[PDB]
A = this chain, B = another copy of it.
Amino acid sequence: GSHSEADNYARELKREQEEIIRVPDTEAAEVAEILARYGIEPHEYGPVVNALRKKPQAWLDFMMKFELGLEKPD
């Protein structure tokens, strides 16, 4: 039929927040991996990671876009 389940966004949003809460250290290295793909060095991305960790809402939206390739609608 015509579809109305919470899409992949809604489902991924849930999963991603838990990880942040439950294994923040793992989610922080994920950001390193992502930025490191583009040649960036730890001394350059260290403070970025550090900024996101102190901002649980930002960090979630960051992971959504950078790790998972999905935009917050509106």
Contacts and interface: CB of A to CB of B under 8 A. Distances in A.
Interface in A37-65: 37-41, 43-45, 47-48, 50-52, 55, 58-59, 61-62, 65
A66 B35 CA distance: 10
Q: Which of A48, A50, A55 counts the most B-chain CB atoms under 10 A from its CB?
A: A48
A1 interface: no
Interface of A: 35, 37-41, 43-45, 47-48, 50-52, 55, 58-59, 61-62, 65-66, 69, 71
B51 A41 contact: yes
Contact of A69 (B38, B52, B69): B69
A51 B44 contact: yes
